[PDB]
Amino acid sequence: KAYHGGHLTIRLALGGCTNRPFYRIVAAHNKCPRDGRFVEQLGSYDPLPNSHGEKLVALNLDRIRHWIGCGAHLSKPMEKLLGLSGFFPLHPMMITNAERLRRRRAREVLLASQKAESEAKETEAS
Amino acid sequence: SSLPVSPYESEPWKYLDSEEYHNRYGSRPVWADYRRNHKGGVPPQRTRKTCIRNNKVAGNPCPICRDHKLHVDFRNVKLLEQFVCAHTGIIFHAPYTGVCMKQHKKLTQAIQKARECGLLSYYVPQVEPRDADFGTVHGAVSVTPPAPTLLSGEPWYPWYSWQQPPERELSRLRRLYQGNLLEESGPPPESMPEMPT
Amino acid sequence: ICRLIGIKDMYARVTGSMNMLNLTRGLFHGLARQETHQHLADKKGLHVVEFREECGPLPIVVASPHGALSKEPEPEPEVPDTKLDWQDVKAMQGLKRSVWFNLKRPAT
Amino acid sequence: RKTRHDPPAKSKVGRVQTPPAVDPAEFFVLTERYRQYRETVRALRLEFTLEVRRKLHEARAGVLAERKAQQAIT
Amino acid sequence: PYPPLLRAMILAERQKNGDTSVQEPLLNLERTRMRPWDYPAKQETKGRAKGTPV
Amino acid sequence: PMKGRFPIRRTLQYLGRGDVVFKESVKIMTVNYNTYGELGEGARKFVFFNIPQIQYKNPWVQIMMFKNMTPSPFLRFYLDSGEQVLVDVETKSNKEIMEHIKKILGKKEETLREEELEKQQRFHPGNFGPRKYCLRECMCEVEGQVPCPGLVPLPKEMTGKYKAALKAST
Amino acid sequence: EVKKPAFMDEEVQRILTKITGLDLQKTFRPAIQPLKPPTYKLMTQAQLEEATRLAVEAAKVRLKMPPVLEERKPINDVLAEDKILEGTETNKYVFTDISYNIPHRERFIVVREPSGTLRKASWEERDRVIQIYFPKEGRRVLPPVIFKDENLKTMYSQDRHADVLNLCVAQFEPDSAEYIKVHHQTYEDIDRHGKYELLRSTRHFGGMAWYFVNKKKIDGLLIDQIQRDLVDDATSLVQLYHMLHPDGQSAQEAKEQAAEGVDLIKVFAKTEAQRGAYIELALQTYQEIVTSHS
Amino acid sequence: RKKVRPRLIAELARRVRALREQRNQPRDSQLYALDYETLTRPHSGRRLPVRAW
RNA sequence: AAAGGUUUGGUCCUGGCCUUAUAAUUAAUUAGAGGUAAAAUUACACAUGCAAACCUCCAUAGACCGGUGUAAAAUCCCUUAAACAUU
Ligand code: FES
Ligand SMILES: [K+]
Ligand SMILES: [Mg+2]
Ligand SMILES: [Mg+2]
Ligand SMILES: [Mg+2]
Ligand SMILES: [Mg+2]
Ligand SMILES: [Mg+2]
Ligand SMILES: [Zn+2]
């Protein structure tokens, strides 16, 4: 298609089959389809653990730096990948979500202890 | 429903050296005296899927299926050699020897397994080392100087940790979103609480 | 006929008329009027050397002149005047072959 | 997806916004993380923008670029 | 500071080029400072609604 | 039998044997040769054998040939700067003419090698995609990675059909 | 300090090339691979000798010895420890820089562990991922099963040592532990069974003699070189042994007596030979055969 | 080519439409009018967000 | 194409047709489960529901994604200039 307006973006293009996802990191005009016309492929992401239990991300850091220097935006999933790698700082919501998970597990542990204490009362009753 | 039982099941390689094998086959391959029955002069590009269905055998059993004592095993290298080109070392396609597609797949796996364990020889090309230079002094493969925060034990950036908001700022947000508020949360646990089990 | 002669590896194409007698007479005519490497070395007086791609640059001498070895190199033209067959050349020019070509067939 | 000339759904005439509820302590901490995060990323995007322009200028008018041009003429 | 991986790539390049130093790479934030989100925007370049009534 | 004389001239291998790749300045090469004579034999062979090879490697250069217009054969190159390079090819073999033009107006081997490497800069082995552009279409092809569900059925716990059933069960 | 000789030292490469030998028939033995119809050229004796010269030039490049290196040191560097991300992920992430123009040993391959530690990838992890993104013909992503001791012993029974080593070079890196393990196991089997001829006119002979010299077990190779009438090779081996062990009693004895030629081998027998009695016997028998017949 | 032909109606339409826009430009008193009972703009029928009520 | 069948009382030559290989759709008869891919008579007419919102008012978006193969020898490849409803 002949797009009018839009910007270059670095995003994940979904590949693979059903229940077997595989991603291609690409630089593409934002208005193009998710799996359609792109400008350059900048790496790949395999989200499924392999035989060694490792999720494999490949980043062409020389081309990624080139396209960020030319105005390319980043999708939120790609910003999360760059933060985990260490090339970018950790995303604010990566930290906030980790804090929410910590507060949510603390409640669960406390509830189990309360249930165990309630179970202890049942043991006292015999 | 009674397929014959081979005496050489445990040691398949034995059959190919026994006198019975020599009389039946001599020194020619086991597919030498097999011919496929088909209409036309150009044959179909695939052989029959399988010669044996539920203990029944087809009209013209293929070289492997016709002889029950023949066993396709990675250890039976002498049988496997007959299905590999001596000059090019390429496994023959199924139409070449006339074996059924089931046994051709089984033969291909046995030949590949025999080669991997070294029982069956194949040509190993000579390839140069991967890297022109074998130095290991670059930072990628060496020790990077530890960052100041890492030595002290602090977070890489100050905002990675929870910094309690000023009390005046918490009141400013309670006024802005008055009537649609949630219970205020304190500092999060220092570590990840161990999963309850 | 090739099995009767003992030839094990060869390619052939027959075109024009498929007359069985003319094919047998023409086949024997050509096969009997070929030139062995030993004959070629004697006619030209030079060594006949063989270069296989599976043996690398190793030169293989297959026939040496019976009498006196010459010292004048055989003339190598810049561009040969050979008469080429379109059927042989067409393949190397990238032209698609027929669906009937190089089909999987039983061992001969 | 609908075009601007398509009619609105009738099941959705009632819709009104229901803004999320705000936790004061975590909302403020998150707002500061976004401000500091976006400052770091703008400093890195600027540094990446300079490497692109430095590399381009070296190719266009670098030492090696000028010598080859005259070498060909000579 | 620089991000953890990007800091290691800078220090590694220093050693390769022969630059020997223990200086810590530092990002400069003065050139790229963000305005508050509620800062007044440029009204001159803002769009105006069309004149077709709904 | 391929028609014409020297049918090898009409083969892709022969056309690719040409070694004269002109510099970007070269725009036109006019060839003035005589069909009869003795001192112009090399020029006639140059038109017969070499002009096809030159054009094959220089598709954008205009080669126009004129016959029996002058007493002697010559080659004149027209450059983009406006310079005109006259060459005298009388009493010169066709091979000698090719070597002469290669020296004065032919790109060097180093220049041609650099261009070939630059052309392939954007092909990466790691890149995944169609066979025309990439070695592997999917990471399932790689050894050790989770195989394609079509070839190998996935474990039940890794399937949305199974996971959705549990969520209903919960 | 007098520098310890290296594998690539121009002097060592000279001696190792000589003892290895050349044989155009063994170096260019026909490969069992897809074949093409041979080509034929009529050549004079001058042209034929020129063609043999180019064949020997190619046999030199073909016999180039593979590097002999020390075992690499484990990569144990922690770039960061972001504990905020502890417990938020179950599987490790492996990030590989796939910029085309970086040498593979200068690429950054990091691992973000579930604890949050950002560390550099180990050597085994580095080689696996570089195969996935820069695949090398001959190498497999996961270690093959042919290199297991039981499988390797089978290849040795079939006298396929040159293949075991050609496979070890396509798969493993020269400084890896697996590379050193397989090579040292192949070289050790050749010694015990006296199969030194298998690797002659091959690129693997130099490393084998190097391994014996450094491990002070050249005795078998001298006995076998002498019995094959290659006594110029045996002397050169004693020169290499007197070069890598200058302070050895044998090297000091040869300086005292200014021994040369067959004398050098006799000096080794008396001074440092593990089995000196046999070296003299084989050396003596060789001299008797040479003197008696000629 | 030369079988691609002018589109007079298309050219006429574009100009004519643009002219009407300039002639019948609305004013701020109409575009930004509000119905305070429903908090909806009569011009476009755009109901203001909840946090602004 | 590695070819074969078929003109005649018979032979040779010429020459067409057809067979043998591969794949898609529909149809006849017949059929267990599982995984995966694809889903397609018709630019003829369409009941019903849904497919574009967001948001402290202004703006932004609904110009995309998705669909079909209408028109048209319609194009490919390349050069030059210019903007951009952009970043
Ligand atoms: S093609 Fe890769 S998962 Fe199916
Ligand atoms: K016919
Ligand atoms: Mg606003
Ligand atoms: Mg007739
Ligand atoms: Mg049907
Ligand atoms: Mg589309
Ligand atoms: Mg139409
Ligand atoms: Zn069968």
Residue numbers in the entry:
A (entry chain M): 10 to 135
B (entry chain O): 42 to 238
C (entry chain D): 325 to 432
D (entry chain U): 27 to 100
E (entry chain 0): 165 to 218
F (entry chain T): 2 to 171
G (entry chain R): 63 to 356
H (entry chain 0): 3 to 55
Study text:
Mitoribosomes are essential for the synthesis and maintenance of bioenergetic proteins. Here we use cryo-electron microscopy to determine a series of the small mitoribosomal subunit (SSU) intermediates in complex with auxiliary factors, revealing a sequential assembly mechanism. In this study, we determined sequential cryo-electron microscopy (cryo-EM) structures of stable assembly intermediates and initiation complexes at 2.8–3.2 Å resolution that involve six factors: RBFA, TFB1M, METTL15, mtIF3, mS37 and mtIF2.
As several rRNA methyltransferases are required for the assembly, to stall the process, we first depleted the enzyme TRMT2B, responsible for the formation of 5-methyluridine16,17, which produced a viable cell line with stable rRNA and allowed to purify intermediate pre-SSU particles in different states.
